Amino acid sequence: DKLKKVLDKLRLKRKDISEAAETVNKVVERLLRRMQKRESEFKGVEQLNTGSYYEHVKISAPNEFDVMFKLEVPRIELQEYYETGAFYLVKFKRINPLSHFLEGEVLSATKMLSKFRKIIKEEVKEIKDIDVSVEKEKPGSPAVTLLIRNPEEISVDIILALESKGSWPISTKEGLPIQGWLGTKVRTNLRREPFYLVPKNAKDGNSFQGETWRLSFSHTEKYILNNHGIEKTCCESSGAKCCRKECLKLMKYLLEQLKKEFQELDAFCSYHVKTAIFHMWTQDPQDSQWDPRNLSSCFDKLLAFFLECLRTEKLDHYFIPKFNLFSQELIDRKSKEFLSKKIEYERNNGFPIFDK
Amino acid sequence: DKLKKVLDKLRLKRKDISEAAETVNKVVERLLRRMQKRESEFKGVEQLNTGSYYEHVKISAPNEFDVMFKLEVPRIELQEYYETGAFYLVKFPLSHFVLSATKMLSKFRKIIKEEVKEIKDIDVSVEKEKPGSPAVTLLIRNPEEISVDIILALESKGSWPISTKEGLPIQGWLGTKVRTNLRREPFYLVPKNAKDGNSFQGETWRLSFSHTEKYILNNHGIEKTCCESSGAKCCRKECLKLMKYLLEQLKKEFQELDAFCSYHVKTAIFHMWTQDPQDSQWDPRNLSSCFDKLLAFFLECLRTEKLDHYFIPKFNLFSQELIDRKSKEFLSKKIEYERNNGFPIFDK
DNA sequence: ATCTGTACATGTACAGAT
DNA sequence: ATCTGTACATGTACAGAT
DNA sequence: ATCTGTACATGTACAGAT
DNA sequence: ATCTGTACATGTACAGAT
Ligand SMILES: Nc1ncnc2c1ncn2[C@@H]1O[C@H](COP(=O)(O)OP(=O)(O)OP(=O)(O)O)[C@@H](O)[C@H]1O
Ligand SMILES: Nc1ncnc2c1ncn2[C@@H]1O[C@H](COP(=O)(O)OP(=O)(O)OP(=O)(O)O)[C@@H](O)[C@H]1O
Ligand SMILES: [Mn+2]
Ligand SMILES: [Mn+2]
Ligand SMILES: [Mn+2]
Ligand SMILES: [Mn+2]
Ligand SMILES: [Zn+2]
Ligand SMILES: [Zn+2]
């Protein structure tokens, strides 16, 4: 009931959705069309909407949209980057519009991203209907981010992705453990869909920096978010409603509110809570372990699970089991203990950060 | 325990499946070849396997197989025949055939008969044509008797006909998303090959949802994991097998049941699966009461003379027009007897 | 004349609104 | 409870191309 | 256009375990 | 008696090659 009111605060307004989507779809459509023009290296690129807004777990406002511009690259060979599981070099087999981004048969990611960014920047210049600019590049980001002032501020991440239709890389063989929850047929069908590669774009100074790509499963996460129950009728008009998405929203909002205040939490991002709850949904497969009447204890057990991931320094990528999002190389102990304490304080004092 | 032993009897043998299928697949691949490996009107026909063998509810022997040869036809107008729900006139390569079902079936049949004639490695012939059948039926002996029904079908990719809008009522069982996706698939038309002497009989086709029934049979739980390797077994298919066996055994003995077919049983269990959607209502420990509830539901269908097409609800398969009252009362008496005596007919 | 990539046309699950 | 805007899957029309 | 290759669903069969 | 793990078998979706 206390959490029932927070969700009411977090709920998007149709008026805002309508206003924001009108602008966003206009800008996205124009950019998609410019990539189809001339001898553009990105001709054939197709659009895939992803992220919280299209999973219906966007909270507070419709002010951030994620969209994949995906390009199918056939006849592709991958080299895993130093057994990390998630990062790859991409290589080609013949001697192609990606000609100008090739090196030693190796597809440069920062070369491709730069050209992609240059096209988007020029196209944005010739929009005089909407107040829209291109954000300064961020290290580690695979995206060209648009800032729309619709009056209201709106971010759009245009994510460049390679699309391979072959079978998924073996580092994912033990990932996606949905057998006891969504089952073997769903798992088999999901793994028949393409996989995606986005630029790592780390800028950190290490070898292969500009030629490292990162696996993306945004499309698989979108399907799961929207087909999340063991029962096919879960959250449908002739079935029972669960509180799975509501628990994600509350967890997202806790991290968002804390990150707004404490810049010690810069290492953390909402993908961490999204990954955590995919494990909770696998651990607790039954729709009855997510009854809306038990929202408080369902949110609590998610917090307890997240706190144990922070303390034990282990939050395995849901799709790549050997990739630890909470490794020391990515987040130091200090950052994790700080978040542990901040969460435990919220937990134990009525969630006062929900009232800010 | 009695029912478990019956199901052990009904179970097909790996060796039998392997010998029957490699011969059936030989013949079918060759007919499918001929259909487009010639300037025939059926160039572009594609194969779709259907029926109990491919749903894994075939019982006793692998001795009957069903195959659709389906052909895409663009821009066709349907016209419902006299409000029957299931039967239609088709209208606008094939212009040798208003699209007459009788005219198309016969050329299709003539092709198959010719290709069967030039098969020398398998003992195979074409059964005499049956009024009422949309099929060309092949008889194989290797030495086991095996019959194959080659079913000609038109494939339309528009919205399903209006008479189905109330059909397929899976919303509380498989859900709205499965229903919407199933209805995004094509719908099929097959010949109505009756000789009854009625008016438009020769150019009427009948709706087929064999493709949709296959998906259901193999995606039948309310839980996605039903009968999967990380899920629980249910006894839904076993119940269909048992009810199928009861009717097969009765039809063997009683000529009075010639009007009944396994599709009646299949239809009745689709309604029971919709009435009782929870997988726990089909627990394997409760096989007996599950079988009994199917019997009771089937008997209520007989008693009220009402068994609606699961996809076309106004089409009553138990109409007085199609099955006489005395047939239904005869079958009622025989089922009530088997029920009340421990199913003696299951022991022979 | 026919061919075809682009985009309209149709239908409905999701979830906010009343 | 019903009404309703957006997203999205798939079927089809046709301007401009061949 | 056609056809093989791959992966894993659905089954049956059976020994060893419970 | 049933359950579980491995072996053995066919069916079917679709990527990629030719
Ligand atoms: N570090 C990451 N590793 C893998 N995938 C990621 C990562 N960060 C983001 N993604 C993918 O990109 C999508 C968009 O990311 P984003 O940061 O906008 O979050 P979101 O899930 O849309 O939620 P919100 O925008 O409301 O914070 C995610 O849903 C996820 O699929
Ligand atoms: N009267 C009918 N109306 C509609 N569809 C039918 C009818 N009879 C058969 N079919 C379709 O054709 C398929 C093949 O029918 P068939 O008579 O071979 O039975 P079956 O379901 O395969 O089982 P079995 O052959 O083991 O009795 C059916 O499963 C169904 O999809
Ligand atoms: Mn986002
Ligand atoms: Mn983003
Ligand atoms: Mn059959
Ligand atoms: Mn048949
Ligand atoms: Zn749900
Ligand atoms: Zn089952």
Coordinates of N, CA and C and ligand atoms in Angstrom, one line a residue, chain A residues 228-229 233-236 240-245 287, ligand 7:
Chain A
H228 N 6.7 -12.8 -19.5 CA 7.5 -12.9 -18.3 C 7.0 -14.0 -17.3
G229 N 5.8 -14.6 -17.6 CA 5.2 -15.6 -16.6 C 5.4 -17.0 -17.0
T233 N -1.0 -16.9 -19.7 CA -2.0 -15.8 -19.4 C -1.5 -14.8 -18.4
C234 N -0.3 -14.9 -17.9 CA 0.2 -13.9 -16.9 C 0.1 -12.5 -17.4
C235 N -0.7 -11.6 -16.6 CA -0.9 -10.2 -16.9 C -1.7 -9.9 -18.1
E236 N -2.4 -10.9 -18.6 CA -3.3 -10.8 -19.8 C -4.8 -10.5 -19.3
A240 N -4.2 -13.7 -14.6 CA -4.0 -13.1 -13.3 C -2.8 -12.1 -13.5
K241 N -2.9 -11.0 -12.8 CA -1.9 -10.0 -12.8 C -0.8 -10.4 -11.8
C242 N 0.5 -10.2 -12.2 CA 1.6 -10.4 -11.3 C 2.3 -9.1 -11.0
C243 N 3.2 -9.0 -10.1 CA 3.9 -7.8 -9.7 C 5.4 -7.8 -10.1
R244 N 5.7 -8.6 -11.2 CA 7.1 -8.7 -11.6 C 7.6 -7.3 -12.1
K245 N 6.9 -6.7 -13.1 CA 7.3 -5.4 -13.6 C 7.3 -4.3 -12.5
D287 N 4.3 -17.9 -11.0 CA 3.6 -16.7 -11.0 C 3.0 -16.3 -9.6
Ligands
ZN7 ZN 2.7 -10.9 -15.1

